[PDB]
């Protein structure tokens, strides 16, 4: 019997960034 | 909302959405689900190009016209765009802000219905990566309570792998089976679409042409499904009528115009699909005799099987032809196959059965199963026939093949289809199957041992019965027994090779005049009974191509030609002549 | 009937959802399928049809027009396939018992190993049995499963190996078409 | 002539980009080569020097003198390396037959099986031949490609599903370099 082959699974990375505000006056 | 959701009833009033034809059975199931108190979210599951979105979009058309039941009247279908909605968020809460606003609008209108094309996208990654706040989870409680109605569309491949992983979402969405329509249904569908396509291209499609498009496309285009396939060929024909005509040409689209566009889609030379290639088939036997002379009984047999296959008398599911070229070497058993492909203008496939001798070699032809090396590879045999549906298949030295390989061919002859590792059905009923073996030649030439010689006429056939199993021989259409080359036939072979060398050098400007004595000498040395005429190309290369090639670059032979070959009787060697 | 029928036929869903799906869908059918002469009540016959659509096989319509099909099934097969009447009797009688409600309830409709010479009708009666019954034909050529490792193709590869997402051909095919004829040609070669 | 030598010697870009680049490059060089003098006309020998810079090959080899180098191929190898004179001379006559244009063009130009004791310069003639003709040198040791699984690497990597750019080891080298010698060592043990 031929040897088995394993397949890896790569997870993508994406994140959300907050936003600070600066009033003019 | 403002741009993420596009209403289909308002669009239907203007146009755009094509009308539905022959889908009352499928529509009735959807309406029954939409009218349910809970889980009224039908899911259209069907293969690619089977009208997956023609039923959702057409539901709006029916609602505007009024064909739908009274309960479904006053309902609005919304086509959600996940890409547009998800695009431009650039924040954690922008998606939920717009998404919830969409649900708020639908929740307010109890009769509103949502259409989510390609619903499998949200389950994978709707609006979150490296987290768990997905778009599906937001609508899970709403669907369970029947607050909003959602119509989904996803393919079977994207339904078993992506969908059904989150049983919660699958529970809410009912499944409506969609099947590819028949040929009679599609021709009726194209008739309804003719005014839209005709006005767009300002042409007319004959009734005969429409029936030929679906029929020819199915035979020559197997990758795509029939509904979208027929639309592509029909629409493509109108485009040609816009650019090819110079001015005031015929607007009607005849059958001949469809055969050209469909040929390009299949990468064929237009000879097979065209109905004007009968001249080639009528003289195919005579043409092959000039290319490969000898054994006329073997050449005429192929033409008879090919003629019936293209005359409407071919087998319903078996290949065009299965043959076992049982004969000696050097009788052009493989040459007849390569030349046949050129005549029919189809790809040539050659497989060496000597490599497939071990029990584990059969896997390479059909691919390795899941979980083992080679699974990514579809398979040499399966990928070749799938890539080239119209091609010639050659299997040389089949007798040496392992029995596991013979078993694969059993289904090929009877059913015309072979499954691969990935499950793709190799529909190649158009390819002609040819096999070459030298099993019985040994008994024919070799006499029976003993003082008295027995009748060996039937001994050759008996060997094929023991080597090949009865089921394999029964599936074969015919066995072509080749005959040994005669003294006159071999002399013509020498002229054939010299013609290729003569014409190859004639264009260069070097004339070749081979003497008759040299031709006779090359025949004996070049043609061995055990090995056939295979050494002819080798001796011709060493005897003629080697000396002439050297002087071609430098010397008088570069120009002027005037080459005259001769043979001396004192030493029997071949003399060479060169002049300016 | 909805609770009992759902457990016996509907699969991949739990009993509260399964029973409530048949009851809800049955209300829309009786309320919307007949344009006129509607049925105010919902009898057992209606619930059986709804379960049959969800599971693709009926349980009480056997004495309907389909009844006449089972009678001519044996005779029609004899016309298409001559001789070997004993084999047609086995298939037609097995279907009749299953449809009539005398099935095993834990085994298939029938499992018959047709063995004989080449070209005598082994792969014809089966092909002509699906066409007469109007059901999909799950044709599986066992000549491909020559080695033990080929079993993965039938039930898919296990987790953590290539081809895991592909799944099983036999399992997925049967799930798509539960009512069908499963043909394993040349089983000995496997 | 520019198009013939551009595609062969550069071996970096495709045919259409090379011609437009060399033509523009040639005009600029001749336009500013002398401080005061100038040559409105162009010649083959002039543009040949330009290709040498982008190709990083001497102008002599870049010159369209393949016949000259082929004629003195034996004299060049015998002068650059010593020994195996009989073996080197036989190789030159055979290569001339292929470059003459006779025979089937689809077939490969190189059909040579070296066979002798190592350490006598067998490897050196393969690199010297490529250096003289200008073609690249691609060395593929068969000993590494001994395992049955290793054979598959030549056509494609086993786990390279995302990485389809690399492709097979043998195929990528030939694809990138269409004019290069392939040196296979220890082919008997395969
Ligand atoms: N009893 C039969 N009645 C009518 N046609 C038959 C009959 N037996 C064989 N045929 C014809 O021969 C074809 C092949 O018969 P099958 O029964 O399918 O062969 P098979 O038993 O699968 O053969 P193997 O693979 O060699 S064991 C059928 O498709 C019919 O065309
Ligand atoms: N019943 C039908 N009536 C009219 N046109 C149809 C019908 N079914 C399919 N079509 C046409 O065939 C195509 C169907 O594409 P569709 O199945 O929605 O694509 P996809 O599978 O990629 O989502 C469209 O061009 C559509 O107009
Ligand atoms: N009868 C023939 N007519 C023309 N060429 C022939 C004939 N017999 C052999 N040849 C030549 O022999 C060579 C090999 O032909 P091929 O068909 O591969 O042989 P085989 O059937 O013995 O395997 C080719 O050069 C082919 O043209
Ligand atoms: N004919 C020769 N002339 C000069 N040096 C030689 C000769 N034959 C062998 N050698 C020496 O032996 C080496 C053998 O080749 P090398 O590339 O080092 O290893 P390999 O033979 O394993 O490829 C040469 O590089 C050189 O050092
Ligand atoms: Mg679509
Ligand atoms: Mg059979
Ligand atoms: Mg060395």
Inter-chain residue contact A6 with C149, CB threshold 8 Å: no
Inter-chain residue contact C24 with B39, CB threshold 8 Å: yes
Q: What Å resolution does this PDB entry report?
A: 3.2
The CA distance from D126 to D139, in Å, is: 10
Helix axes D15-32 and D44-55, enclosed angle (nearest 10): 110
Would an 8 Å CB–CB cutoff place D103 in contact with chain B?
Answer: yes
Per-residue DSSP letter, A22: -
Centre of ligand 3 to C-alpha B329, Å, is: 8
Residue in the structure block whose two tokens are 């102008």: D59
- The HSE-up count of residue B278 (CA atoms within 13 Å, CB side) is 4
Q: Is D81 in the pocket of ligand 4 (CB under 6 A)?
A: yes
The CA distance from B384 to B378, in Å, is: 10
Which of D96, D99, D24, D91 has its CA nearest to residue D54? D24
- How long is chain D? 190
Q: B432-437 and B391-396 as β-strands: parallel, antiparallel, unpaired?
A: parallel
Residue by residue, DSSP assigns C56-96 as S--SS-TTSTHHHHHHHHHHHHHHHS-S-HHHHHHHHHHHH
Phi, then psi, of B113 in degrees rounded to 5: -130, 140
The CA distance from B545 to B281, in Å, is: 37
| Residues of chain D contacting A5 with CB distance shorter than 8 Å | 158-159
Q: Which residue of A has its CA nearest to C161?
A: A6
Would an 8 Å CB–CB cutoff place B290 in contact with chain D?
Answer: no
Q: Partners for C (CB, 8 Å, 3+ pairs)?
A: A, B
Per-residue DSSP letter, D9: I
Rounded to the nearest angstrom, the minimum Cα separation between C152 and chain B is: 6
- The residues, any chain, with a CB within 8 Å of residue D129's CB and separated by 6 or more, are D73, D77, D91, D181
Decide: residue B461, CB within 10 A, 0-12 exposed, 13-18 middle, 19+ buried.
Answer: middle
Would an 8 Å CB–CB cutoff place D97 in contact with chain B?
Answer: yes
Q: Is B54 in the pocket of ligand 2 (CB under 6 A)?
A: yes
E strands in B346-397: 347-352, 391-396
Cα-to-chain-centroid distance, residue B463? 36
Inter-chain residue contact A1 with C162, CB threshold 8 Å: no
The answer to whether B66 touches B13, Cβ cutoff 8 Å, is no
Distances (CA, A) of B123 to B107, B119, B132, B405, B452: 22, 8, 11, 43, 83
Centre of ligand 4 to C-alpha D125, Å, is: 10
Distances (CA, A) of B73 to B6, B62, B69, B78, B266: 19, 9, 7, 15, 45
Collapsing DSSP to helix, strand or coil, B513 comes out as strand
Centre of ligand 3 to C-alpha B332, Å, is: 3
E strands in B313-401: 321-326, 347-352, 391-396
SS3 labels along B85-105? HHCCCCCCCHHHHHHHHHHHH
Q: B291: which 2 tokens?
A: 């290319």
Would an 8 Å CB–CB cutoff place D168 in contact with chain B?
Answer: no
Q: B439: which 2 tokens?
A: 């099993």
Which of B280, B240, B232 has its CA nearest to residue B256? B240
| Residues of chain B contacting A18 with CB distance shorter than 8 Å | 91-92
The preferred substitution site among B51, B58, B234, B235 for testing ligand 2, maximizing ligand atoms within 8 Å of CB, is B51
Residue in the structure block whose two tokens are 């005509």: B245
- Cα torsion D34, D36, D42, D43: sign: negative
| Residues of chain A contacting B130 with CB distance shorter than 8 Å | 11, 13-15
The residue whose CA has the least distance to atom 10 of ligand 2 is: B51
Breaks (C-N over 2.5 A) in chain B follow: none
């Amino acid at each position: 019997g031929k040897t088995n082959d394993w397949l890896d699974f790569d997870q993508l990375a994406e994140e959300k960034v907050r936003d600070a505000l600066k009033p003019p006056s | 909302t403002e741009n993420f959701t596009t209403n289909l009833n308002q669009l239907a009033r203007v146009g755009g959405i094509d009308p539905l034809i022959g889908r009352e059975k499928e529509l009735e199931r959807a309406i029954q689900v939409l009218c349910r108190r809970r889980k009224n979210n039908p899911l259209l599951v069907g293969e690619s190009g089977v009208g997956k979105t023609a039923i959702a979009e057409g539901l709006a058309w029916r609602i505007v016209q009024g064909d739908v039941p009274e309960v479904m009247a006053d309902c609005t279908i919304y086509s959600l765009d996940i890409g547009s909605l998800l695009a431009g968020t650039k924040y954690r809460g922008d998606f939920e802000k717009r998404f919830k606003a969409l649900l708020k609008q639908l929740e307010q209108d109890t009769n509103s219905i949502l259409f989510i094309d390609e619903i499998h996208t949200i389950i994978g990654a709707g609006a979150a990566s490296g987290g768990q706040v997905d778009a599906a989870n937001l609508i899970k409680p709403l669907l369970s309570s029947g607050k909003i109605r959602v119509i989904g569309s996803t393919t079977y491949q994207e339904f078993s792998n992506i969908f059904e992983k989150d049983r919660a979402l699958a529970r809410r969405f009912q499944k409506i089976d969609i099947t590819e329509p028949s040929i009679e249904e599609t021709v009726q569908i194209i008739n309804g679409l003719k005014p839209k396509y005709e006005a767009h291209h300002d042409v007319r499609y004959t009734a005969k042409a429409v029936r030929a498009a679906v029929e020819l496309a199915v035979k020559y285009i197997n990758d795509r499904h029939l509904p979208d396939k027929a639309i592509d060929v029909i629409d493509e024909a109108g485009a040609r009528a816009r650019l090819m005509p110079v001015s005031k040409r015929k607007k009607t689209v005849n059958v001949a115009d469809i055969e050209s566009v469909v040929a390009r889609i299949a990468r064929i030379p237009e000879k097979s699909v065209s109905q004007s290639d009968r001249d080639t088939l009528k003289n195919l036997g005579d043409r092959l005799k000039m290319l490969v002379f000898g054994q006329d009984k073997a050449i005429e047999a192929l033409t008879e099987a090919i003629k019936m296959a293209r005359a409407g008398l071919g087998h319903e599911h078996k290949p065009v032809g299965s043959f076992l070229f049982a004969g000696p070497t050097g009788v052009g058993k493989t040459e007849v196959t390569v030349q046949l492909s050129k005549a029919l203008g189809i790809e040539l496939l050659r497989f060496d059965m000597s490599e497939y001798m071990e029990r584990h070699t059969v896997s390479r032809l059909i691919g390795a199963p899941p979980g083992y090396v080679g699974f990514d590879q579809g398979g040499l045999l399966t990928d070749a026939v799938i890539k080239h549906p119209h091609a010639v298949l050659l299997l040389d030295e089949i007798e040496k093949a392992h029995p596991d390989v013979f078993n694969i061919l059993l289904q090929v002859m009877d059913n015309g289809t072979l499954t691969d590792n990935n499950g793709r059905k190799a529909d190649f009923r158009n390819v002609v199957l040819v096999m070459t073996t030298n099993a019985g030649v040994r008994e024919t030439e070799r006499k029976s041992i003993g003082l008295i010689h027995q009748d060996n006429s039937t001994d050759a056939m008996e060997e094929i019965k023991k080597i090949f199993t009865p089921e394999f021989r029964n599936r074969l259409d015919n066995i072509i027994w080749f005959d040994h080359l005669s003294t006159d036939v071999i002399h013509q072979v020498v002229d054939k090779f010299i013609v290729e060398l003569q014409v190859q050098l004639d264009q260069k400007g070097v004339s070749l005049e081979v003497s008759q004595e040299a031709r006779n000498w090359l025949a004996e040395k070049g043609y061995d009974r055990a090995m056939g005429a295979r050494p002819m190309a080798r001796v011709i290369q060493d005897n003629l191509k080697k000396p002439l090639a050297n002087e071609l670059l430098f010397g008088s032979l570069v120009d002027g030609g005037q080459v005259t070959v001769a043979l001396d009787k004192e030493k029997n060697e071949l003399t060479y002549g060169f002049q300016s």
